[PDB]
């Protein structure tokens, strides 16, 4: 059956209800930055060097100083339970298993507390919304230290949501049984009534003083950004946008990175996250200077097949996807990725 990532989407459609499938796949608006987040890996061609003896393939890496088996890791996707009953108890499992980290959605549908219990050992850091109510936030960013987790993902580039058509005509909700546990598009109307599109600069210099945890800015597109970010003593940039749900017609993210490797001048972690589903995206990501990169939507199809056994699936073949990338383009570890293996 399921060998490669695209397999598990096509399974995912077969057996989730059309409005939570469509939630899940949905991009903003005409989706022309959905299609491109993937075609753009496309133009990015590989020049792999031969005879370099890769027999001892290592696949291991740090994020914000913490190891993982391989720099692959699970970005934030809301509402999990939606997908597989056991939701993100069942990611936070494979993660473990897998030696990689999860980052846990402010919007799951399963706590702070919970997701540490089922995963004490995992790599687990927080996605963060600034809500309009600051003491909810703060409590969230208290919990996320008690419970263990290593760093804040502040996602920047939500004011508002941005408007994904099939939600708006399967006038989106949780199904009846599910909660946010932490607490037209009936999501849409969630974030305009909670989420603050206030928020500025003056706000991340509010967080950076609350955590002492690392922070990293979430949906920087911008050179002159992520410069800001570093400049407010942020200690990473997560080159998003947004799994192309916010602003149509921004860049892909692969095609963004390295302006946004450049402006940083190597003063902290540069991550992508947006079209990433073969292990050559993960291989071109890292030779334009990523550290690592996130994946959203394949763990959520990872999910829809079988729970924790469907995500350690999924990233199992993007592991081994990458390995191979790694192995036929000359690199023995992710150190010897270098910026010659790509151009466009
Ligand atoms: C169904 C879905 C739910 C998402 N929920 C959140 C969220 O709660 N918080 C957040 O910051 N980003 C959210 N994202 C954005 C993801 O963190 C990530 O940027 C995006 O999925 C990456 O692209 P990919 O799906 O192509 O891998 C969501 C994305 C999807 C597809
Ligand atoms: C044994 N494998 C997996 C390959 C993938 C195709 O057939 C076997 C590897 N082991 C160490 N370093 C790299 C690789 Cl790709």
Same mark, same amino acid.
């Given at each position: 059956?399921?060998?490669?990532?695209?397999?598990?989407?096509?399974?995912?459609?077969?057996?989730?209800?059309?409005?939570?499938?469509?939630?899940?796949?949905?991009?903003?608006?005409?989706?022309?930055?959905?299609?491109?987040?993937?075609?753009?890996?496309?133009?990015?061609?590989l020049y792999p060097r031969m005879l370099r003896n890769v027999?001892?393939?290592?696949?291991?890496?740090?994020?914000?100083?913490?190891?993982?088996?391989?720099?692959?890791?699970?970005?934030?996707?809301?509402?999990?339970?939606?997908?597989?009953?056991?939701?993100?108890?069942?990611?936070?499992?494979?993660?473990?298993?897998?030696?990689?980290?999860?980052?846990?959605?402010?919007?799951?549908?399963?706590?702070?507390?919970?997701?540490?219990?089922?995963?004490?050992?995992?790599?687990?850091?927080?996605?963060?919304?600034?809500?309009?109510?600051?003491?909810?936030?703060?409590?969230?960013?208290?919990?996320?230290?008690?419970?263990?987790?290593?760093?804040?993902?502040?996602?920047?580039?939500?004011?508002?949501?941005?408007?994904?058509?099939?939600?708006?005509?399967?006038?989106?909700?949780?199904?009846?049984?599910?909660?946010?546990?932490?607490?037209?598009?009936?999501?849409?109307?969630?974030?305009?009534?909670?989420?603050?599109?206030?928020?500025?600069?003056?706000?991340?210099?509010?967080?950076?003083?609350?955590?002492?945890? @690392? /922070? #990293?800015?979430?949906?920087?597109?911008? %050179?002159?950004?992520?410069?800001?970010? $570093?400049?407010?003593? !942020?200690?990473?940039?997560?080159?998003?946008?947004?799994?192309?749900?916010?602003?149509?017609?921004?860049?892909?993210?692969?095609?963004?990175?390295?302006?946004?490797?450049?402006?940083?001048?190597?003063?902290?972690?540069?991550?992508?996250?947006?079209?990433?589903?073969?292990?050559?995206?993960?291989?071109?990501?890292?030779?334009?200077?990523?550290?690592?990169?996130?994946?959203?939507? @394949? /763990? #959520?199809?990872?999910?829809?097949?079988? %729970?924790?056994?469907?995500?350690?699936? $999924?990233?199992?073949? !993007?592991?081994?996807?990458?390995?191979?990338?790694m192995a036929l383009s000359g690199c023995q570890?992710?150190?010897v990725?270098?910026?010659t293996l790509?151009?466009?």
């Amino acid at each position: 059956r399921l060998i490669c990532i695209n397999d598990y989407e096509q399974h995912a459609k077969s057996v989730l209800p059309k409005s939570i499938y469509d939630y899940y796949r949905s991009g903003a608006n005409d989706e022309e930055t959905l299609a491109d987040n993937i075609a753009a890996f496309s133009r990015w061609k590989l020049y792999p060097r031969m005879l370099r003896n890769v027999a001892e393939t290592d696949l291991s890496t740090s994020v914000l100083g913490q190891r993982v088996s391989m720099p692959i890791c699970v970005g934030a996707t809301a509402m999990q339970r939606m997908a597989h009953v056991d939701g993100e108890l069942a990611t936070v499992r494979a993660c473990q298993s897998l030696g990689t980290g999860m980052m846990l959605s402010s919007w799951a549908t399963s706590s702070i507390e919970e997701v540490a219990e089922a995963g004490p050992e995992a790599l687990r850091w927080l996605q963060l919304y600034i809500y309009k109510d600051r003491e909810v936030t703060k409590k969230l960013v208290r919990q996320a230290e008690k419970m263990g987790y290593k760093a804040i993902f502040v996602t920047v580039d939500t004011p508002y949501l941005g408007n994904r058509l099939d939600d708006v005509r399967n006038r989106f909700k949780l199904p009846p049984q599910l909660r946010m546990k932490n607490f037209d598009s009936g999501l849409a109307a969630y974030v305009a009534k909670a989420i603050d599109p206030s928020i500025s600069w003056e706000d991340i210099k509010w967080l950076r003083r609350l955590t002492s945890l @690392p /922070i #990293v800015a979430k949906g920087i597109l911008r %050179g002159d950004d992520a410069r800001e970010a $570093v400049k407010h003593g !942020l200690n990473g940039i997560l080159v998003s946008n947004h799994g192309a749900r916010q602003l149509d017609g921004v860049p892909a993210t692969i095609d963004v990175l390295p302006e946004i490797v450049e402006a940083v001048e190597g003063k902290v972690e540069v991550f992508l996250d947006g079209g990433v589903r073969k292990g050559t995206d993960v291989l071109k990501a890292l030779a334009l200077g990523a550290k690592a990169v996130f994946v959203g939507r @394949p /763990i #959520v199809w990872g999910l829809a097949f079988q %729970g924790e056994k469907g995500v350690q699936d $999924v990233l199992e073949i !993007l592991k081994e996807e990458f390995r191979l990338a790694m192995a036929l383009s000359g690199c023995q570890n992710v150190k010897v990725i270098d910026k010659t293996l790509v151009r466009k």
